[PDB]
Every structure is written in C-alpha cells, then in structure tokens.
C-alpha cells in the first residue's frame, strides 16, 4: 500500500 499515495514509488517496485 505505497503507490496509493503517489509518493511511495521506490518500494512500490
């Protein structure tokens, strides 16, 4: 649940 904030792209992978 990281890309859901448009700020966590790195860990999003």
Curated annotation (Swiss-Prot):
Changing residue 7 to K: 1523-fold and 14.2-fold less potent to inhibit rat CHRNA9-CHRNA10 and CHRNA7 nAChR, respectively. The record marks 5-7, 9 as: Key residue for potent inhibition of the rat CHRNA9-CHRNA10 nAChR. Disulfide bonds join 2-8, 3-12. Keywords: Acetylcholine receptor inhibiting toxin, Disulfide bond, G-protein coupled receptor impairing toxin, Ion channel impairing toxin, Neurotoxin, Postsynaptic neurotoxin, Secreted, Toxin. It is found in: Secreted. One of its GO terms (cellular component) is host cell postsynaptic membrane. GO terms for molecular function: acetylcholine receptor inhibitor activity; ion channel regulator activity; toxin activity. Expressed by the venom duct. The disulfide bond CysI-CysIII is important for alpha-9-alpha-10 subtype inhibition, whereas the bond CysII-CysIV contributes to GABA(B) modulation. Changing residue 9 to K: No significant change in potency on human CHRNA9-CHRNA10 nAChR. It comes from the Eukaryota. The record marks 7 as: Binds to the Pro-224 and Asp-225 of the rat nAChR CHRNA10 subunit. RgIA[Del13]dimer is an analog therapeutically interesting because it is the first dual inhibitor that potently and selectively inhibits alpha-9-alpha-10/CHRNA9-CHRNA10 and alpha-7/CHRNA7 subtypes, which are both involved in the etiology of several cancers. The keyword Disulfide bond applies. The record marks 11 as: Binds to the Glu-221 of the rat nAChR CHRNA10 subunit. This toxin target two types of receptors, the nicotinic acetylcholine receptor (nAChR) and the G-protein-coupled receptor GABA(B). It specifically inhibits the alpha-9-alpha-10/CHRNA9-CHRNA10 nAChR, with preference for rat receptors. It interacts with the alpha-10(+)/alpha-9(-)interface of the receptor. Negative results: this toxin shows a weak activity on alpha-7 nAChR (IC(50)=3310-4660 nM). It also shows a very weak activity on alpha-2-beta-2, alpha-2-beta-4, alpha-3-beta-4, alpha-3-beta-2, alpha-4-beta-2, alpha-4-beta-4 and alpha-6/alpha-3-beta-2-beta-3 nAChRs (IC(50)>10 uM). The derivative RgIA4 (S23T; R28Citrulline; Y29(3-I-Y); R30Q; R32Y) has been under preclinical studies by Kineta under the name KCP-400. It was tested to prevent chronic cancer chemotherapy-induced neuropathic pain. This studies has been discontinued. Belongs to the conotoxin A superfamily. The cysteine framework is I (CC-C-C). Alpha4/3 pattern. This is Alpha-conotoxin RgIA. The lineage of its organism: Eukaryota, Metazoa, Spiralia, Lophotrochozoa, Mollusca. The chain holds residues 20 to 32 of 32 of the full protein.
């Amino acid at each position: 649940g990281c890309c859901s904030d448009v700020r966590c792209r790195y860990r999003c992978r």
